[PDB]
Design an enzyme around this catalytic site. Structure first.
Site, short mmCIF file in Angstrom:
data_model
loop_
_atom_site.label_atom_id
_atom_site.label_comp_id
_atom_site.label_asym_id
_atom_site.label_seq_id
_atom_site.Cartn_x
_atom_site.Cartn_y
_atom_site.Cartn_z
N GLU A 130 -7.93 -1.09 -8.54
CA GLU A 130 -8.10 -1.67 -7.23
C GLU A 130 -9.27 -0.98 -6.53
OE1 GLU A 130 -4.82 0.75 -4.43
OE2 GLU A 130 -4.88 -1.47 -4.56
N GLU B 55 -10.92 2.42 -7.58
CA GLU B 55 -9.84 3.06 -8.33
C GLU B 55 -9.85 2.61 -9.76
OE1 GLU B 55 -6.97 3.01 -4.42
OE2 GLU B 55 -6.02 2.86 -6.40
N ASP C 37 -8.64 8.07 0.96
CA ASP C 37 -8.07 9.37 1.21
C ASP C 37 -8.42 10.49 0.26
OD1 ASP C 37 -6.10 8.62 -0.70
OD2 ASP C 37 -4.46 8.77 0.82
N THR C 38 -8.53 10.12 -1.03
CA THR C 38 -8.88 11.07 -2.09
C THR C 38 -10.27 11.66 -1.85
OG1 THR C 38 -9.61 9.30 -3.62
CG2 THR C 38 -7.37 10.11 -3.89
N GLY D 225 2.12 2.66 -2.18
CA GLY D 225 3.18 2.37 -3.13
C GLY D 225 4.38 1.81 -2.38
N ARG E 154 1.32 13.10 6.46
CA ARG E 154 0.16 13.93 6.15
C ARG E 154 -0.35 14.49 7.49
NH1 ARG E 154 -4.31 10.69 4.07
NH2 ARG E 154 -3.32 10.60 1.98
N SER F 33 0.85 -1.19 0.00
CA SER F 33 0.00 0.00 0.00
C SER F 33 0.89 1.24 0.00
CB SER F 33 -1.02 0.01 1.14
OG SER F 33 -0.88 1.10 2.05
N1 LIG Z 1 -0.86 -0.60 -14.14
C1 LIG Z 1 -0.72 0.63 -13.79
N2 LIG Z 1 -0.65 1.59 -14.78
C2 LIG Z 1 -0.50 2.95 -14.57
N3 LIG Z 1 -0.41 3.53 -13.38
C3 LIG Z 1 -0.49 2.64 -12.37
C4 LIG Z 1 -0.62 1.23 -12.50
N4 LIG Z 1 -0.72 0.67 -11.21
C5 LIG Z 1 -0.60 1.73 -10.36
N5 LIG Z 1 -0.47 2.95 -10.99
C6 LIG Z 1 -0.33 4.27 -10.37
O1 LIG Z 1 0.19 4.12 -9.09
C7 LIG Z 1 -0.71 4.57 -8.03
C8 LIG Z 1 -0.62 3.67 -6.80
O2 LIG Z 1 -0.81 2.34 -7.34
P1 LIG Z 1 -1.55 1.28 -6.42
O3 LIG Z 1 -1.68 0.00 -7.19
O4 LIG Z 1 -2.92 1.83 -6.14
O5 LIG Z 1 -0.66 1.14 -5.14
P2 LIG Z 1 -0.91 1.07 -3.57
O6 LIG Z 1 0.37 0.83 -2.79
O7 LIG Z 1 -1.86 -0.05 -3.29
O8 LIG Z 1 -1.50 2.50 -3.25
P3 LIG Z 1 -2.87 2.87 -2.58
O9 LIG Z 1 -3.27 1.62 -1.69
O10 LIG Z 1 -3.95 3.11 -3.62
S1 LIG Z 1 -2.58 4.26 -1.69
C9 LIG Z 1 -2.06 4.62 -8.74
O11 LIG Z 1 -2.89 5.54 -8.04
C10 LIG Z 1 -1.63 5.02 -10.16
O12 LIG Z 1 -1.32 6.41 -10.26
MG LIG Z 2 -4.58 2.53 -5.40
MG LIG Z 3 -3.93 -0.25 -2.81
#
Ligand SMILES: Nc1ncnc2c1ncn2[C@@H]1O[C@H](COP(=O)(O)OP(=O)(O)OP(O)(O)=S)[C@@H](O)[C@H]1O
Ligand SMILES: [Mg+2]
Ligand SMILES: [Mg+2]
Ligand SMILES: Nc1ncnc2c1ncn2[C@@H]1O[C@H](COP(=O)(O)OP(=O)(O)OP(O)(O)=S)[C@@H](O)[C@H]1O
Ligand SMILES: [Cl-]
Ligand SMILES: [Mg+2]
Ligand SMILES: [Mg+2]
Ligand code: NA
EC number: 6.3.1.21
Lengths: 385, 386
Positions: A272, A260, A279-280, A161, A356, A159
């Site tokens: 996802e 998302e 948060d958004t 990133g 944050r 999560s």
């Molecule tokens: N396949 C993909 N193609 C393009 N952009 C991507 C892709 N996967 C993720 N992103 C970008 O990366 C961001 C974070 O990716 P996530 O897969 O949502 O990661 P995360 O660690 O689960 O973050 P959260 O849980 O949403 S905060 C997204 O909001 C997009 O901007």
């Molecule tokens: Mg996400």
């Molecule tokens: Mg996520």
């Protein structure tokens, strides 16, 4: 729906598993209906605790601990704020009669990308990015090989990133695999979308209802700004809702979900989903009659939503300083509030790095203006250590 | 304006004197800004204590008691929610450096009808009902004969129409006096026949005096039953009403939201009284504005600029005012009291013993008439038991 009086014997009790800023607003919405709130987290004085009736500090990843606090508090609802919880104990507790919001299965599927991705892609037959799961670097290597460049690699249990890596070169592989281990992953095929949105979907007694699409800006894995409504084709929108409905229904239970998605032309791709406020969605604190938080509580308490009013172009902009301190102060606040402008300061006890600490909220005649107004106000706040 | 982090050493501390449903919202608004909140009242588990960092229960009428708790928590601000507090100590504290909201004088003036009435009427020369004060039954009787019938007698220290009598004739003189003694000194006012009455929520802030759109309300037996916004008024009446409100707030002094009660007779406006703080009728603002009267009061007293207030269209509030005796009240049929453009607030009050406002229903619609019906309807659906 029958509600008791907080602190009285027939009180209705809500246990929050995770007490950050999102949990803080759910807590306020429970308080507004005189619902008893117990805020749980891994550290003392988490924002939700400031507004709860009582709190507990525990290792939420520790099922036994979880069981002990739950059992002790005997909540009517268990509301997780984050992924980082022992979802296995949630399943059991649910199996035992606890009401987990939205449902325990939901929490589980979503804490692991394999689950959710498979469900959506395969089971629901929805548009997603190309992907592959790997158990070994060889396979990882093998996988990145099949996906191509560029490509995203993420821990199935990540999560904000975390452990993720954007791959355009074979050289990162060494480290990429290492970061992603810091032990299973996903390799995704980068999508080239016009924009990203959060479709805040509430599943309740009167069905599924959607909030106007929320667009946003991410950077270094943190949302920076969000706005509503994001301009989308009627067709694009129709599609986004279809996907969101299928997903939420698929996960099940009442609550507000953060779906998302990526938008390319009239085309929508599933990324996802958060089985809870996102948060958004903080922009809904100024953009709707009912905030995402209010919606979550309405839903889970088994109450009908009926409708969501949107008040025009609106935006959120985070207050995300980076310093080390246990005694933060905020100066110049008089320049961060005003007409159609508000700010929230979370009450976080300390910071050590990037965190944050609040958010600026704005409304305007245009989405663009809303964004500038919000950005500017967040930027006027002087965060001192 | 510098704000600390609650619970941290540099925290900004707010003390609420009175932890009712109005205080509750003020507390949430403070908490939303990471402001540290200490809630004080005369009973435990009062609404605002539910959302405070710490709570104390004392005799707020006890100056000494008050000083002790202030000494103990060292708040930056002292925020009174009711009239019944040691105003003389407030004054001391304010001299001893404490920020009393909106100011200690405003609090002294309004704690008794005499102070505020003579100020408005005599010193400020604002239009008000005729009035006469009385400290004996005979002087009471002399005042009525001078005021005439019908007239209303009220204890100088009271609220929510307690011990008040709408006197139509001499027959009632005796009982009127007795009942008044039940809620010393009394006020005898001439009956104003207005078209309607409003609460003009006036904010005195660093950037000036701001006005919320006029709030109309309906009173019954001492309690407001419904409120709505905006209440229609001529341009001239609105201007006169704002001139009156600005004068009184500035006269009272300090930053905060004030609840200016006015009677409206076509284009004419008459001053009734004023809350140097948020007003129950202003609860409609919890659904009808971007910034509720609570968010506004906080913004103001923290020294921040208001900028402006957004009104979202026709809305109304309707109280949930059951009558029972219980220390374990429950609310059923909740699924039929909320929905599209319809919400409720349940205060968390620990007990009831007769009639008491335990919550409020809020609604928006295309007209105040439809909002009010929607809101009364929802309040009515709630099944209060205990
Ligand atoms: N396949 C993909 N193609 C393009 N952009 C991507 C892709 N996967 C993720 N992103 C970008 O990366 C961001 C974070 O990716 P996530 O897969 O949502 O990661 P995360 O660690 O689960 O973050 P959260 O849980 O949403 S905060 C997204 O909001 C997009 O901007
Ligand atoms: Mg996400
Ligand atoms: Mg996520
Ligand atoms: N002189 C007057 N003429 C006509 N109506 C009056 C007069 N004084 C009061 N009323 C009516 O009676 C209601 C109650 O009078 P208040 O003076 O406001 O009593 P109260 O005990 O102070 O109640 P609060 O403080 O508003 S809760 C008003 O809101 C009017 O509806
Ligand atoms: Cl007199
Ligand atoms: Mg009064
Ligand atoms: Mg009054
Ligand atoms: Na003051």
């Amino acid at each position: 729906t029958l509600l008791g009086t907080a602190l009285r014997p027939a009180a209705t009790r809500v246990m929050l598993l995770g007490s950050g800023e999102l949990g803080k607003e759910v807590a306020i919405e429970c308080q507004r209906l005189g619902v008893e709130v117990i805020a749980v987290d891994r550290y003392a004085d988490a924002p939700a605790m400031h507004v709860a009736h009582r709190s507990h500090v525990i290792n939420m990843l520790d099922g036994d601990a979880l069981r002990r606090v739950v059992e002790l508090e005997k909540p009517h609802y268990i509301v997780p704020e984050i992924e980082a919880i022992a979802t296995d104990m949630l399943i059991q507790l649910e199996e035992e009669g606890l009401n987990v919001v939205p449902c325990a299965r939901a929490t589980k599927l979503t804490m692991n990308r394999e689950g959710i991705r498979r469900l959506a892609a395969e089971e629901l037959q929805l548009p997603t990015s190309t992907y592959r799961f790997a158990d070994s670097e060889s396979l990882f290597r093998e996988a990145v090989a099949d996906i191509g460049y560029p490509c995203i690699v993420k821990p199935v249990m990540s999560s904000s990133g975390k452990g993720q890596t954007f791959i355009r070169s074979a050289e990162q592989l060494a480290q990429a695999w290492k970061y992603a281990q810091q032990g299973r992953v996903i390799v995704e095929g980068v999508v080239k979308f016009d924009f990203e949105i959060t479709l805040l979907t509430v599943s309740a007694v009167d069905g599924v209802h959607f909030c106007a699409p929320v667009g946003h800006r991410q950077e270094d894995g943190d949302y920076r700004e969000s706005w509503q409504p994001q301009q989308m084709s009627p067709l694009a929108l129709e599609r986004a809702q279809e996907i969101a409905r299928k997903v939420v229904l698929a996960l099940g239970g009442y609550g507000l979900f953060g779906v998302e998605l990526f938008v390319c032309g009239d085309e929508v791709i599933f990324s996802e989903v958060s089985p809870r406020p996102h948060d958004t969605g903080m922009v809904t604190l100024i953009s709707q009659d009912l905030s995402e938080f209010a919606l979550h509580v309405r839903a889970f308490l088994g109450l009908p939503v009926g409708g969501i009013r949107q008040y025009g172009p609106a935006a959120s902009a985070v207050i995300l300083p980076q310093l080390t301190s246990q005694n933060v102060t905020f100066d110049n606040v008089q320049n961060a509030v005003g007409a159609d402008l508000q700010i929230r300061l979370f009450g976080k006890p300390e910071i050590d790095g990037s965190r944050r600490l609040g958010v600026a909220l704005a409304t305007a005649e245009s989405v663009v203006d809303a964004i500038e107004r919000a950005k500017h106000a967040a930027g006027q706040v002087k965060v001192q250590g």
